Design a protein around this ligand. Structure first.
Ligand code: 1FZ
Ligand code: CL
Ligand code: MG
Ligand code: NI
Length: 417
DNA sequence: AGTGTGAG
DNA sequence: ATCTCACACT
């Protein structure tokens, strides 16, 4: 149950090269041939952001060497990418997924699912008899097939898993996970049938393990990670690959303890971890290296902030007053469009406008931030309000010159009510 | 409460 | 992602 962190059934669904698939649905000639999606940029034909798996075999990567490669491009608006098409496809899939169990949309192409309830309901409604392997055509059970080889090995491991599953104990963690994988198999089948899109999934007891499991067998495949498989999986799992350990905390763990893999954290005591990383982080690390994590999947859905920004690196850095005013207006117009849709869809209005900037030479993400009331959904008014609070923040008193220059402009609406 | 951190 | 959004922290 909770002592061993097997209290829930969590899944992570991530679309395989989502943007590529969205383009392939519109232009058929691109569906089963190596292609990519570019943003029109005069350097190299434009930067690549989404690459199909077919092209990855040739060594093609995102951010040329596959002459057959076909290209599709993102519409551009106000100097940045326009992702409306993708947001609409994301919403489509999310609505389809919400039918099988409640979800937490985590990004434009992936979402967590809490199947605990659905798994309980499914074991009851089920006769109570066994689960045939035919319900898991694309499920991999991690670590088991120990002791054409791609396919089939999966089926042997699946057979050993099913042959060792509890039959009578309906609260058996492994059984709950197996049923969760069945439900995910159905969910993905429905998604493909109704949209044509393929995706991958991870099934485990918490968000961290579900996210890690999803990437174990991509694409169009799903992986089940049991509590018993956690030690082996962590034995050579880079610390920085765990959700929330990708930044300074993870690097700090590596440097202070002189370790690289998650499983090595098992050798330290809870008191040791608290004495080196603090009470909260020490306990979190102690349980996570053992496969235990409790972050709940939250259906809550309306956003707490709505905003947009744009970066101007190096040469492009905003130098004149005219430039900063124009880009603030562009940002406020995009903001107005989105806030308008927000108010139409959720009957709420933003009461605060946050303005943030970054000056060339500053290592921090943002050089400063100020705020002001957001009374009217007027791009022109908002542009002047943001400009007014940030305008005195300039060193050059020389006219027609902004000093220091700006390398980033950010506008954000919050405090909804 | 604004700053800093982290995911995707 | 070579942008949007969440939230922990005296
Ligand atoms: C990580 C990342 C994603 N994206 C965009 C393009 C992807 O289609 C979209 C989905 O992000 P992802 O889930 O991280 N990667 P993917 O879905 O495209 O590919 P896959 O899951 O590894 O097969 O986000 C970038 O433009 N730059 C990036 O660095
Ligand atoms: Cl903010
Ligand atoms: Mg993906
Ligand atoms: Ni004006």
């Amino acid at each position: 149950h909770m002592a061993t962190g097997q209290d829930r059934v969590v899944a992570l669904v991530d679309m395989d090269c989502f943007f590529v698939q969205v383009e392939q649905r519109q232009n058929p000639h691109l569906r089963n041939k190596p292609c990519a999606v570019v943003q029109y940029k005069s350097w190299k034909g434009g930067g690549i952001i989404a690459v199909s798996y077919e092209a990855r075999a040739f060594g093609v990567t995102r951010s040329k060497l596959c002459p057959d490669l076909l290209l599709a491009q993102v519409r551009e608006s106000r100097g940045k990418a326009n992702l409306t098409k993708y947001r609409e496809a994301s919403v489509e899939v999310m609505e389809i997924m919400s039918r099988f169990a409640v979800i937490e949309r985590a990004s434009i192409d992936e979402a967590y699912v809490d199947l605990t309830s659905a798994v309980q309901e499914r074991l009851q409604k089920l006769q109570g008899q066994p689960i045939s392997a035919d319900l898991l055509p694309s499920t991999y059970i991690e670590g088991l097939p120990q002791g054409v080889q791609k396919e089939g090995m999966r089926k042997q491991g699946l057979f050993q898993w099913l042959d060792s599953l509890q039959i009578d104990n309906l609260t058996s963690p492994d059984l709950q996970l197996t049923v969760g994988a069945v439900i995910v198999e159905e969910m993905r089948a429905a998604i493909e049938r109704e949209t044509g899109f393929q995706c991958s999934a991870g099934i485990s007891h918490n968000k961290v393990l579900a996210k890690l499991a999803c990437g174990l067998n991509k694409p169009n495949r799903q992986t089940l990670v049991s509590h018993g498989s956690v030690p082996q999986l962590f034995s050579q799992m880079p610390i920085r690959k765990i959700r929330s350990l990708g930044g300074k905390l993870g690097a700090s763990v590596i440097e202070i303890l002189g370790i690289e893999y998650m499983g090595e954290l098992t050798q330290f005591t809870e008191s040791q971890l608290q004495s080196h990383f603090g009470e909260k982080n020490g306990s979190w690390l102690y349980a996570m290296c053992r496969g235990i994590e409790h972050d709940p999947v939250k259906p809550r859905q309306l956003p707490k902030t709505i905003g947009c920004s744009k970066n101007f690196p190096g040469k492009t850095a905003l130098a004149t007053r005219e430039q900063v005013q124009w880009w603030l207006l562009q940002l406020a117009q995009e903001l107005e469009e989105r806030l308008t849709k927000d108010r139409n869809d959720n009957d709420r209005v933003a009461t605060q406008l946050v303005v943030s900037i970054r000056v060339q030479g500053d290592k921090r993400l943002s050089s400063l931030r100020r705020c002001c009331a957001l009374t009217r959904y007027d791009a022109h008014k908002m542009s002047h309000d943001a400009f007014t609070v940030i305008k005195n923040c300039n060193t050059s008193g020389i006219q027609t010159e902004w000093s220091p220059p700006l390398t980033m402009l950010f506008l954000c609406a919050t405090k909804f009510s």
